[PDB]
Amino acid sequence: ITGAKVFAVYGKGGIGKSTTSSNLSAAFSILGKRVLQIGCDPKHDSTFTLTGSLVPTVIDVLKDVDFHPEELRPEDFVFEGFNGVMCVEAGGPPAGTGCGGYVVGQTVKLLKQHHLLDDTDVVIFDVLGDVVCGGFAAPLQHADQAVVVTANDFDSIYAMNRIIAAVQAKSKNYKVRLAGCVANRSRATDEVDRFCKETNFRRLAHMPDLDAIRRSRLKKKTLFEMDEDQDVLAARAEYIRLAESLWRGLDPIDPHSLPDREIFELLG
Amino acid sequence: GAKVFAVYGKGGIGKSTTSSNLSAAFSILGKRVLQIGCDPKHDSTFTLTGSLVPTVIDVLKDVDFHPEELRPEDFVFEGFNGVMCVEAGGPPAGTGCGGYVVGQTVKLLKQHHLLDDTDVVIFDVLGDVVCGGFAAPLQHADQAVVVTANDFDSIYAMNRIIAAVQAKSKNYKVRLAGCVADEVDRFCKETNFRRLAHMPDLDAIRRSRLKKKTLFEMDEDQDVLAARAEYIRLAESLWRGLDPIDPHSLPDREI
Ligand code: SF4
Ligand SMILES: [Cl-]
């Protein structure tokens, strides 16, 4: 992918990864950029808040024409969401067989087959961070920066440590660098900060999704489409700064992943 | 040629706690247990041996991919009540299929014939993704026990695990033995699944003690002995041979 800044939003599930991913796309669109969010999570609900409905996955449409990306139209797997944010979700691989790199590989293949990347200025990959195998690490081959999503619990810090090693493994042969980590919502961050100081990482922003912003409205609309109040405007500003920082570049860092055993003795 | 079960389910919902106590349950029942932790976070056998045992990929890292001079003392460790257990370890971060790690941890066991004496084998497989790589333990498993909870993510993962066992059963011997953990019961009725039991260790017992040692090794109290009976009743129920069932998977839009 060329001619567009690509960011891979990593992080494990259950912490609101799709929330921080879809709002970053909407924040880029507020700043006047053409955004294109690629949903790579098996749970194809990353672009739900952008479109307002379940977008048909690319693998669902490809499994209808017997794997022939010829009769497919751009309006069959790419849908326009809030503020013109183009939404395409790869979906999950077949249950039991098939690889994740195939679902990610075919999505980018049709995006370049129909020339659906010449107009987009920002590409947002929402990638599952629960595993860091080469199949789900495929969006790192196209991304410029990789912002990881993490929470204060142990499983998120363990996944973040696994993504740091995965991105830096791809960093030796690809342009992808680690831009830092982002707390999922405004809570305690002492355990995340201690991991950053030990790994020479860094935490970026801190969105206030915990205070108010009822989960029913979180997963329904995006923050830039909700009605304005104190908490919405405060959370909107946290995503505008994150989008602007990633746009005009950040000062590079050189983190390192702790061994899988040294992270247990760090937290517990 | 022995009974083998695959503990499947999403992470963070105490799946490793379920697979560990299930292994120790078969041990108390007088069975040779072999728990193979396939989770990338190789903490499946933490409560058994009391320590983070070296993984297969970590041994092959300082062994230069050479399974020549490898002995059972390197990767297989003696756990609680004589439970042999080995962590397969996570795939290399960035590149490397999960099926390769599962494929290289079963050949290292068959190379030494460490299965001609065991009776029950427990597979702790990560259920966050139901891709073909992580679905490799389903090929050998006789049945698969799903770990879930009342949240959406655990039910969504269980719904994809059922579809993963269905497709894998068309060419293998894997079956669906049910699930363990209100809203889950509404899922089983629509999918014709089965809700086995429910271990009551969320309250009174401390997750710190849960992640420390197995329930069969803790100090004998009222709450831990009631939890031992739940895992003992589950171990014998699987050994007796539960009445098989054919659950169907739901579309992702319907789930
Ligand atoms: S590369 Fe990853 S997604 Fe693909 S089969 Fe292997 S473990 Fe599964
Ligand atoms: Cl709308």
Numbering used by the authors:
A (entry chain B): 28 to 295
B (entry chain A): 30 to 210, 217 to 290
Reproduce the article's own wording on this structure.
A key step in bacteriochlorophyll biosynthesis is the reduction of protochlorophyllide to chlorophyllide, catalyzed by dark-operative protochlorophyllide oxidoreductase. BchL serves as the ATP-dependent electron donor, and BchNB is the electron acceptor containing the active site for Pchlide binding and reduction.
R. sphaeroides BchL was crystallized anaerobically in the absence of nucleotides, and a crystal structure was determined to a resolution of 2.6 Å. The overall conformations of the AB and CD dimers are highly similar (Cα RMSD, of 0.55 Å). The position and specific interactions of the N-terminal residues in our nucleotide-free structure suggest a possible autoinhibitory role by forming a barrier to docking and shielding the [4Fe-4S] cluster of BchL. In the both the ADP-bound structure and our nucleotide-free structure, Asp-182 appears to form a weak hydrogen bond with Lys-39 of the same chain but does not interact with the other subunit.
